[PDB]
């Protein structure tokens, strides 16, 4: 009873607290500062994809090794989503992206060095388990500094570094893997070819993300909700004074006074340790409460049947390209299909960016999601590599705006005190879906290509028919 009425109103005054502030200098130093760790997000989904044809013959792997690298990644990413979303909502946002790069880096760089298969699965495992956490980490701290004015565009124009992450993947793997003049020897005892310098190079996001946001202050929502009430206070007025002085007005004064608040070493660790794991299970199991379950229910639906289609279905793309390159065949260019799949995800971007608000989310997720549904459809009619090349851009170009009016619903449907830890939860069962749909989706091909359509088909109308349920978000306040 009490502690809503009083979050209620924190959440009120923060409101007004932040059109004080206004949109500027701070936010849009902050949206780089944080699109560095979504890059680095894009980037690590494309490495282990680009690597294997020329690891195979270094580590001797058998098929089923090349498979368990393939479900590496996300396995991991699974992991560290739910670990380091449920942290975030007790140690803080820009503590836990901190640990969470530092991690992904650390172990991508080993990565590179490592020889065995085993150590190797081991490394990519724990660079997944590192970078799991940045999209949902990512949103709410951005999300926290955004008015409700705009807010879907500005969260909107946040899913752009994902694409970008791409590109750059495909771009550093057309340029370094097939250079194998670039390969030497790091002693006598190691050779060293260039795809593990593709490997080294594709960590560098992440450091360039942890360099940027070491500048970057604390959510003061945060702090807030924590009764941290001085420290909240000195972050907005940084936040305000930033934006005024970048806007030709240094003379403004910062008027808040006062803001609504919510209030052995090895044995001592572990007491730690127990208190935290308790503290995000209670908040994961309050996630579930009778204020949230159906939300909840209803965004597990989408998110796993999205997921499931989308990355069954791109896994599939490939499958029938290879399929079909060979029936031909027997009578750069993988680099190059992959950035023409990610360049094919821009148009989508930039319109769901500029109708978020105007149309919703809700109509942005489930047209998005009934276009996917129909260019599903369409896949039965393909007859030649440039034709599967083309739907499978339209496939991916229409599916974005699903997935960006999705993460932008996420942020706005949970309050500050879950929204990490739901974000997590949610992200999480979106890889576990993504590893099912995956090896599914692989079982299929040779025997027929009409049952994978089927089931992606009808996992995205469910989901279409899902997201019609779950309630409008414009024009309130940040829960």
Request: hydrophobic share 50%.
């Amino acid at each position: 009873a009490q502690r809503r009425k009083e979050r209620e109103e924190l959440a009120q005054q923060y409101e007004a607290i932040l059109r004080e502030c206004g949109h500027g200098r701070f936010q849009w130093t902050l949206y780089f500062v944080l699109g560095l760790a979504l890059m680095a997000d894009g980037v690590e989904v494309f490495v282990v994809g680009f690597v294997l044809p020329s690891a195979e013959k270094d580590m001797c792997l058998s098929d089923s090794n090349k498979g368990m690298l393939g479900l590496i990644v996300y396995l991991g990413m699974m992991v560290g989503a739910f670990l380091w979303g449920g942290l975030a909502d007790r140690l803080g946002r820009r503590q836990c992206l901190l640990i969470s790069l530092s991690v992904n880096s650390v172990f991508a760089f080993f990565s590179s060095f490592v020889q065995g298969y085993g150590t190797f699965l081991f490394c990519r495992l724990l660079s997944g388990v590192g970078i799991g956490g940045s999209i949902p980490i990512v949103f709410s701290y951005f999300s926290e500094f955004l008015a409700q004015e705009k807010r879907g565009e500005h969260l909107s124009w946040l899913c752009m570094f994902w694409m970008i992450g791409g590109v750059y993947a495909a771009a550093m793997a057309w340029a370094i893997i097939p250079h194998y003049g670039w390969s030497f020897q790091m002693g006598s005892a190691y050779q060293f070819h260039s795809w593990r310098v593709f490997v080294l190079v594709c960590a560098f996001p992440s450091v360039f993300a942890i360099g940027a946001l070491t500048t970057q202050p604390e959510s003061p929502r945060f702090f807030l909700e924590n009764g941290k009430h001085d420290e909240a206070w000195m972050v907005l007025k940084q936040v305000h004074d930033t934006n005024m002085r970048a806007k030709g007005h240094p003379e403004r004064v910062f008027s808040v006074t006062h803001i609504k608040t919510i209030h052995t070493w090895y044995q001592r660790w572990g007491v730690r340790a127990l208190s935290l794991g308790g503290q995000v299970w209670g908040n994961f199991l309050s996630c579930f409460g009778p204020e949230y379950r159906r939300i909840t229910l209803m965004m597990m639906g989408v998110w796993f049947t999205m997921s499931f289609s989308y990355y069954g279905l791109t896994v599939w793309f490939p499958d029938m390209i290879r399929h079909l390159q060979a029936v031909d065949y027997a009578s750069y260019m993988v680099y190059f299909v992959s950035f023409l799949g990610t360049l094919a995800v821009l148009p989508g971007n930039i319109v769901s960016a500029l109708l978020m608000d105007k149309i919703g989310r809700l109509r942005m997720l489930a047209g998005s999601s009934v276009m996917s549904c129909v260019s599903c459809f369409f896949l039965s009619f393909g007859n030649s590599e440039s034709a599967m090349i083309a739907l499978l851009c339209l496939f991916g170009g229409v599916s974005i705006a699903s997935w960006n009016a999705l993460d932008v619903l996420t942020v706005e449907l949970y309050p500050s005190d879950k929204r990490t830890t739901a974000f997590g939860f949610l992200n999480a069962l979106c890889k576990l879906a993504a590893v099912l749909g995956i090896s599914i989706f692989t079982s299929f091909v040779g025997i027929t290509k009409a049952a994978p359509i089927l089931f992606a088909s009808a996992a995205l109308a469910l989901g279409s028919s899902l997201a019609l349920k779950l309630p409008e978000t414009r024009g309130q306040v940040l829960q």
